[model samples]
Target: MSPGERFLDWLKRLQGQKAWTAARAAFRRSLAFPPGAYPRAMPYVEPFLAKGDWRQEEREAHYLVAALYALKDGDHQVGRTLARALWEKAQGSASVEKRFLALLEADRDQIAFRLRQAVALVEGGIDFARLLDDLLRWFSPERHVQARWAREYYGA
Candidate 1:
């Protein structure tokens, strides 16, 4: 069966079992690419299933929100962008089950790791202040200039 077929088959199984958790696990598994596969032209959107990890779901939520805003520069709704990423990447995978399980197992350690990575990348940069300022602006309607400005203006 094609990867999509396999994914759908299991997807259906999850539905029949009322296994939304399993479905989410499958979602992450769907992103793995076969070795030596040729490069496929795709968007730059980050794969959610491919996320590192999360500590608390709340902290994870913070990272998630930060990432969404950071990526879009501040777009309010990123669900579609994320959904398209899943459709283009995960739905094409053959191991959606593994990925979803990983997500379920993800914890705060991973969240701390990702956050530290972000800080490291920005280390020794004066742009941190500017980067945060843009996020602040997002909460202020009059000063908001779309999400891109946050990263662009601040070097995030």
Candidate 2:
């Protein structure tokens, strides 16, 4: 299975449990910290870690996706990208563009902060596992992640 599928499976298993609540709350609060800076987040996400030492972006992707998923309480509509989800919101509201642009334009230091902001606006479904995959490749050598998201957002 792909990494995203694995992550999604993990989330599915966490559904409707008390541990989910605790984890969701912990991760939600930790978004203000640098990803992984919140120690309370480790117990929930550590098991999902790959076997080898992870690079900075890989670690950031996991932790941030964990927190972002927590914010949504493991509720994913399935098979949708973040921009596509926000595009659903955009249909009714004009503000998603502003927030989406902020996310796209965010600096390295501001990425996590702006990313959380973007996630909060979309009430539609997002593919969390795919999002995790995208984030892990964020500094893509070929520049596909954000570029593709931009096209999806505008095209949708």
Top candidate when judged by lDDT against the true structure:
2
Cα lDDT tens digits for candidate 2, 16-113 = 66688787888889988999889998888788785546786787778898888888877776667898988888889998788887777666688888
- Writing each residue's lDDT as its tens digit, candidate 1 over 1-156 gives 432223223333434565444433332322232211212211111232144342333223333333323333332321222212222334457354244323223343443333233332321222222333332233344544333433332331
User: Which parts of model 1 have CA positions greater than 4 angstroms off?
Assistant: 1-64, 75-88, 111-156
Q: How much lDDT does candidate 2 score?
A: 0.81
Could you tell me the C-alpha RMSD of candidate 1 in Å? 19.4
Q: In model 2, where is the ten-residue run with the lowest total lDDT?
A: 48-57
Task: Report clash pairs, candidate 2.
Answer: none
